[PDB]
């Protein structure tokens, strides 16, 4: 179980760790998060009490290094940093553990929620979407634009999601206009899976990462990407059966975790109605269809 110590908490903040969240008071003796499960990526996220603008946070994997959080009073945010001195880091963590100055990652033994949301998400793929090669962790916030959004402007602070555009020469073979526009299988299987992602696991990893950035940061571009990647599969007549069955699992857990009161900002009515009731795959997403109809019947 790994640990992310905090130097201090000088400003009142809501701290997220994965799907959990805790309020910390201004100058409360808070020194971090312990018992973080090894084997998953994690996200540690912030929303300041005195300015709820910029949600921001850091994706990390405690297998890749020893990470801590320090508040920067100049840039006004909690920054993740890596400690290269293992013995220093162990000594600090031991001190804070003995003083009981850390919250414990509150995982229920039965509960696979986080694994179910991050099954295909790898740090190495996050670091290609979020480009800052000098750090082993990745900063995301509410306002970061996607390479696609920037096309339609600081490229270094951008989310390099794979561009999906149904009315692009990439999506439509000259001579197969009607075919490729009404059936996205070409675009899904040849261009995206065989060509860019190489396999369904990379595709699902990026879809799952897009959803989590949409949910944890209210990142609008991420929400666009999540729905585009769902619609691309649902709009394809020819999809490997394993991929459809896996997508239904993926989406079920995403819809299960979404805060009910964010459904109006996080769910696109057109896409979901198309995917569940009109698309080639309208009858392929039984679990997702049942949770959507029971939890969000007003959207449908």
């Amino acid at each position: 179980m790994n640990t992310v110590p905090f130097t201090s908490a000088p400003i009142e903040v809501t701290i997220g760790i994965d799907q959990y969240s805790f309020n910390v008071k201004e100058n409360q003796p808070f020194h971090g998060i312990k018992d973080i499960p090894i084997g998953h990526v994690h996200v540690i996220h912030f929303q300041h009490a005195d300015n709820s603008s910029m949600r921001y946070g850091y994706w990390f994997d405690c297998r890749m290094g020893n990470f801590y959080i320090q508040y920067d009073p100049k840039d006004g945010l909690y920054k993740m940093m890596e400690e290269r001195d293992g013995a220093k880091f162990e000594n600090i963590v031991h001190n804070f553990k003995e003083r009981q100055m850390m919250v414990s990652y509150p995982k229920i033994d039965e509960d696979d929620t986080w694994y179910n949301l991050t099954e295909f998400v790898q740090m190495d793929k996050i670091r290609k979407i979020v480009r800052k090669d000098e750090n082993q962790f990745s900063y995301v916030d509410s306002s970061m634009t996607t390479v696609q959004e920037n096309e339609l402007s600081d490229p270094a602070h951008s989310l390099n999601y794979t561009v999906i555009n149904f009315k692009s020469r990439e999506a439509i073979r000259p001579g197969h206009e009607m075919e490729d526009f009404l059936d996205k299988s070409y675009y899904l299987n040849t261009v995206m899976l065989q060509g860019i992602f190489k396999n369904s696991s990379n595709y699902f990893g990026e879809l799952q990462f897009a959803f989590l950035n949409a949910m944890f940061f209210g990142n609008y571009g991420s929400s666009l990407q999540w729905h585009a990647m769902i619609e691309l599969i649902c709009s394809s007549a020819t999809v490997p059966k394993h991929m459809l069955d896996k997508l239904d699992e993926i989406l079920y857990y995403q819809i299960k975790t979404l805060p009910e009161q964010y459904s109006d900002i996080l769910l696109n009515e057109r896409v979901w109605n198309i995917c569940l009731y009109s698309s080639f795959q309208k009858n392929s997403l039984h679990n997702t269809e049942k949770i959507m109809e029971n939890k969000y019947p007003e959207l449908l």
């Binding site: 009315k167 692009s168 020469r169 439509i172 000259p174 206009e177 009607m178 526009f181 009404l182």
Partner: protein, 237 residues
């Protein structure tokens, strides 16, 4: 964006543009079968592609053979339309290519946009105008070339005859839409108005009769009377 009453003069500026109307591409008769089911029989159709400034009409005749063994014909007709407009643009020299293509029905936007991806500088626009181009097949010479076709064919017309020698393109378009609206509203009454008087004929090389300027004023008033008369008959007003 969309072409409306606000931007009507734009139709007659020096930017090449085409209207595309697909309402006569897929045409059927509906009939009973021997078992008392219903079946459709396709008849030859056409794409109506018009330059409103010059009157040049690119009439692509859609021969019934293009539907043979095809499904979802109403959907296919839109994509065939877009395919043929795309092929027409590619056939034209660069300096003759349109800068805008205005579709009369919004269902043509996606098909045409997808077929014109290679032309990102040609704008594909809808219109809020209710244009009576469906009545093209009430123009006897256009109906005749469509019905006689035994294979796919493009025929070129000037839908304004020689009117632009005497009137502006704004006025020519106004006269065309009035004639087509009248033919759409009461075809038999409109053709009587146009063809009643045997001393005024249609030149071999024309679509419409050889009215003098004063006769055009009379005809135009008779067409407006017809449309009003028919609106009164429709609404009992």
């Amino acid at each position: 964006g969309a072409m409306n009453s606000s931007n009507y003069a734009e139709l007659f500026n020096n930017d090449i543009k085409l209207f595309v109307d697909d309402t006569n591409v897929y045409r059927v008769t509906v009939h009973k079968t021997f078992e008392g089911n219903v079946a459709t029989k396709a008849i030859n159709g056409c794409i109506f592609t018009l330059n409103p400034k010059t009157g040049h009409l690119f009439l692509k005749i859609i021969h019934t053979s293009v539907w043979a063994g095809q499904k979802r014909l109403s959907q296919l007709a839109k994509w065939k339309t877009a395919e043929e407009v795309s092929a027409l643009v590619r056939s034209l020299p660069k300096e003759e290519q349109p800068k805008q293509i205005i579709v009369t029905r919004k269902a043509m936007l996606d098909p045409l946009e997808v077929h014109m991806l290679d032309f990102p500088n040609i704008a594909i626009r809808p219109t809020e105008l209710r244009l009576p181009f469906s009545a093209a097949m009430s123009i006897d010479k256009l109906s005749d070339v469509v019905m006689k076709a035994t294979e796919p064919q493009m025929v070129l017309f000037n839908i304004y005859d020689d009117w632009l020698d005497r009137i502006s393109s704004y006025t020519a378009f106004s006269r065309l839409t009035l004639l087509l609206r009248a033919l759409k509203t009461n075809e038999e009454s409109a053709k009587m108005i146009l063809l009643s008087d045997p001393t005024i004929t249609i030149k071999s090389y024309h679509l419409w009769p050889s009215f003098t300027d004063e006769q055009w004023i009379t005809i135009e008033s008779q067409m407006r009377d017809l449309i009003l008369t028919e609106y009164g008959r429709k609404y009992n007003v």
